[PDB]
Amino acid sequence: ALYEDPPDQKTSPSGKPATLKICSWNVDGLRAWIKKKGLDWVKEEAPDILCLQETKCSENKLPAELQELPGLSHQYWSAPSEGYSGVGLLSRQCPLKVSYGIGDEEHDQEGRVIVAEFDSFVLVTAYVPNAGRGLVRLEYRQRWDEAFRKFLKGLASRKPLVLCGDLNVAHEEIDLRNPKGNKKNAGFTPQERQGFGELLQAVPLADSFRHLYPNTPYAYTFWTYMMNARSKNVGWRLDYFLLSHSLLPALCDSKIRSKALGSDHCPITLYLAL
Ligand SMILES: [Pb+2]
Ligand SMILES: [Pb+2]
């Protein structure tokens, strides 16, 4: 039933030390997050880049603490034109360029994607549309998936890419506690899984965590608040660090910060040697 993230690996396979630390998190509401000390966590983590999903808070209504963030001061935010969706990206270093959405008006209205370009790569963070209760949004989800894939594909074609976020899909069975009982629930439908795989193959992208821990069970990033889930380790692996194959060599580690509190999701951290 248990999962214990292994120790941070801070050198590349080739022996180069990690130079870049990226942390991703779905915070389930900025203010609620800050409230249940998420900020303090970040402080200890001290990433160079911080990607947040589910801010459910507009840039105009941003909490004060945030701007103060000492080591991460170039901050961008996107949210629907309050209390729903929205994403953010905070960096130690200033990106070459920041953009939003995926270039498709239909999919660009809920503040779900930020694109930040750096020297040696491009970083995309996203909070993916959930299929919903009763798979009522499944069809929309599928359209999204296709449009996203295409977008990413074009991006990668130009610059090596790193994609992170809450992708709202447990890839395979090993990716969740109860595959059987979830095949018809958002996040584990065949449609969704299929989409993910396509993403992988088509971009193409590699699943960082899975790449390093191919046979590791019990490793989740989301547990429903309900019915004591987190406590019983009844979760899903919904958050990823997807990488362009060319970055594999620069890969040091992909972590799952199990114990970090503040949301129904836990953070994930990526170490790259650039
Ligand atoms: Pb949520
Ligand atoms: Pb989610």
Instruction: Give the domains, in start order, of the chain with CATH numbers.
Output: 1-274 (3.60.10.10)
How far apart are the CA of 71 and the centre of ligand 1, in A?
27
Quick check: is 265 catalytic? yes
Neighbouring C-beta atoms of residue 53, cutoff 10 Å:
28
How far apart are the CA of 185 and the centre of ligand 2, in A?
13
Ion ligand 2: protein residues whose beta carbon lies under 5 Å: 166
168 is in an annotated binding site: yes
Q: What is the DSSP string of the chain?
A: ----PPPP--B-TTSPBP-EEEEEEE-SSHHHHHHTTHHHHHHHH--SEEEEE-----GGG--SHHHH-SS--EEEEE-----S--EEEEESSPPSEEEES-S-TTTSSS--EEEEE-SS-EEEEEEPPP--GGGTTHHHHHHHHHHHHHHHHHHHHHS-EEEEEE-S---SGGGBS-SGGGTTSTTS-HHHHHHHHHHHHHTT-EEHHHHH-TT--S--SEE-SGGGTTTTT-EE--EEEEE-GGGGGGEEEEEE-TT--SSSB--EEEEE--
Determine which one of 28, 76, 127, 240 is catalytic. Answer: 127
Nearest ligand (C-alpha, residue 238): 2
Distance CA 90, CA 70 (A): 11
- Do 114 and 152 form a contact (C-beta atoms < 8 A)? no
Distance CA 182, CA 193 (A): 12
- List all residues 6 or more positions away from 172 whose beta carbon is below 8 Å from its beta carbon: 193
Distance CA 180, CA 186 (A): 13
How far apart are the CA of 17 and the centre of ligand 2, in A?
32
Q: Which of 162, 184, 171 is nearest to 216 (CA)?
A: 171
Q: Tokens standing for 106?
A: 């239909």
Distances (CA, A) of 131 to 41, 140, 144, 168, 194: 30, 8, 11, 8, 14
Angle made by CA atoms 117, 118, 119, in degrees to the nearest 5: 135
Distance CA 152, CA 157 (A): 8
Quick check: is 5 catalytic? no
Q: What is the resolution of this structure in A?
A: 2.2
Quick check: is 74 catalytic? no
Instruction: Give the side-chain half-sphere CA count within 13 A for 107.
Output: 24
How far apart are the CA of 239 and the centre of ligand 2, in A?
8
Q: Is 262 left (phi over 0), alpha (psi -120 to 50) or beta?
A: left
- Do 239 and 162 form a contact (C-beta atoms < 8 A)? no
